[PDB]
Amino acid sequence: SERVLSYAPAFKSFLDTSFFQELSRLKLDLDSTCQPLTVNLDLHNIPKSADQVPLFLTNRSFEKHNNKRTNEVPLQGSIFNFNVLDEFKNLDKQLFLHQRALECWEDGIKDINKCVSFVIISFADLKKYRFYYWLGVPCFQRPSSTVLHVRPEPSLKGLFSKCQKWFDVNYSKWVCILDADDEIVNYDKCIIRKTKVLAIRDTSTMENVPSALTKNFLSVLQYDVPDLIDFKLLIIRQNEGSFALNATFASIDPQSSSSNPDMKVSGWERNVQGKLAPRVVDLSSLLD
């Protein structure tokens, strides 16, 4: 294989004004609070200038759940809100995202379609209606040593178009494979060990660059099928840009035998400045 696969940020957050408002009616004083959140992803209608699907948060994200099909894909996360700004700032973001990634890992080895999530950390100044937030999207490579060599595949797909439709129907699934009859089915380690064709539901629109979530799914694949070296990886998008890759698991600075696999984690969203730092929104208009 020619190139070492690189990745694109998974999502771009947008916290609608209704999000901060629902927040103000679901926060307390206690030093923090964790609330579960659900966002429905629309991978069919992505703004033209976007590089990834929006993660669009609203008042409804706090609720029990209404998606309007097909391919709105529900994504679970949570918000961790701090009573005081100093604790928001003092938080170790790396150790924090690392847990979160571990949860995705544990979920993922039980069901590969569950190894992706998002977290928002925040501080709401409910007096000055200013909100500080930082979206993190746990993306992990375990072991941290694994990279992927790729070269273009002309197609040998399930045909992209059959994958597109399969994902539309199976809205809770992020992964599908081909069986021996070259039929798209749900992920099964026994089947893929033999047929070696994996399709991932991509959230990037960047040309020839898959979403960073890809690392999560590959980590699970490499755990289920430790002997897999070469396989075919289909990056499925609902637009024009699906593509296919010949993939080889490779390794950089590997770790000793029967030592326990560490895990490299990233996924904190860059702010408007393009920097790794929180975002701030001031809603003074929640008085006048």
Side-chain angles (χ1 to χ4, degrees), residues 58 141 192 202 228 271:
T58 68
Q141 190 90 93
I192 191 162
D202 200 51
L228 198 53
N271 70 0

PDB file of all heavy atoms in Angstrom, residues 58 141 192 202 228 271:
ATOM      1  N   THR A  58     -30.004  21.232  20.086  1.00  0.00           N
ATOM      2  CA  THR A  58     -31.164  22.060  20.395  1.00  0.00           C
ATOM      3  C   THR A  58     -31.771  21.649  21.728  1.00  0.00           C
ATOM      4  O   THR A  58     -31.278  20.721  22.387  1.00  0.00           O
ATOM      5  CB  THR A  58     -32.256  21.863  19.340  1.00  0.00           C
ATOM      6  OG1 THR A  58     -32.776  20.538  19.460  1.00  0.00           O
ATOM      7  CG2 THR A  58     -31.684  22.047  17.922  1.00  0.00           C
ATOM      8  N   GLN A 141      -7.381   5.243  18.657  1.00  0.00           N
ATOM      9  CA  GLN A 141      -6.725   4.123  17.995  1.00  0.00           C
ATOM     10  C   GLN A 141      -6.120   3.229  19.087  1.00  0.00           C
ATOM     11  O   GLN A 141      -5.262   3.656  19.848  1.00  0.00           O
ATOM     12  CB  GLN A 141      -5.658   4.596  17.006  1.00  0.00           C
ATOM     13  CG  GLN A 141      -5.093   3.469  16.091  1.00  0.00           C
ATOM     14  CD  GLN A 141      -5.864   3.284  14.762  1.00  0.00           C
ATOM     15  OE1 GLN A 141      -5.500   3.876  13.738  1.00  0.00           O
ATOM     16  NE2 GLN A 141      -6.916   2.442  14.778  1.00  0.00           N
ATOM     17  N   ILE A 192     -16.404 -11.471   8.509  1.00  0.00           N
ATOM     18  CA  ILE A 192     -15.423 -10.544   7.947  1.00  0.00           C
ATOM     19  C   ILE A 192     -14.021 -11.127   7.997  1.00  0.00           C
ATOM     20  O   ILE A 192     -13.161 -10.758   7.193  1.00  0.00           O
ATOM     21  CB  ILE A 192     -15.429  -9.164   8.645  1.00  0.00           C
ATOM     22  CG1 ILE A 192     -14.572  -8.174   7.839  1.00  0.00           C
ATOM     23  CG2 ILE A 192     -14.936  -9.286  10.087  1.00  0.00           C
ATOM     24  CD1 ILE A 192     -14.821  -6.717   8.156  1.00  0.00           C
ATOM     25  N   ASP A 202     -19.650   7.201   6.667  1.00  0.00           N
ATOM     26  CA  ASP A 202     -18.719   8.307   6.878  1.00  0.00           C
ATOM     27  C   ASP A 202     -19.456   9.600   7.205  1.00  0.00           C
ATOM     28  O   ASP A 202     -20.567   9.824   6.724  1.00  0.00           O
ATOM     29  CB  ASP A 202     -17.849   8.520   5.644  1.00  0.00           C
ATOM     30  CG  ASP A 202     -16.584   9.281   5.955  1.00  0.00           C
ATOM     31  OD1 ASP A 202     -15.868   8.883   6.910  1.00  0.00           O
ATOM     32  OD2 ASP A 202     -16.290  10.279   5.249  1.00  0.00           O
ATOM     33  N   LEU A 228      -6.074 -10.249  10.939  1.00  0.00           N
ATOM     34  CA  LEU A 228      -6.356  -9.521   9.701  1.00  0.00           C
ATOM     35  C   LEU A 228      -5.220  -8.559   9.372  1.00  0.00           C
ATOM     36  O   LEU A 228      -4.789  -7.771  10.219  1.00  0.00           O
ATOM     37  CB  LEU A 228      -7.691  -8.775   9.783  1.00  0.00           C
ATOM     38  CG  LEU A 228      -8.255  -8.354   8.423  1.00  0.00           C
ATOM     39  CD1 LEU A 228      -8.331  -9.537   7.523  1.00  0.00           C
ATOM     40  CD2 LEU A 228      -9.625  -7.715   8.532  1.00  0.00           C
ATOM     41  N   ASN A 271     -11.707  25.722  17.928  1.00  0.00           N
ATOM     42  CA  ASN A 271     -12.630  26.828  18.036  1.00  0.00           C
ATOM     43  C   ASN A 271     -12.609  27.668  16.759  1.00  0.00           C
ATOM     44  O   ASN A 271     -12.033  27.248  15.743  1.00  0.00           O
ATOM     45  CB  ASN A 271     -12.353  27.685  19.294  1.00  0.00           C
ATOM     46  CG  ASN A 271     -11.060  28.486  19.204  1.00  0.00           C
ATOM     47  OD1 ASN A 271     -10.340  28.428  18.212  1.00  0.00           O
ATOM     48  ND2 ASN A 271     -10.766  29.243  20.255  1.00  0.00           N
TER      49      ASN A 271
END
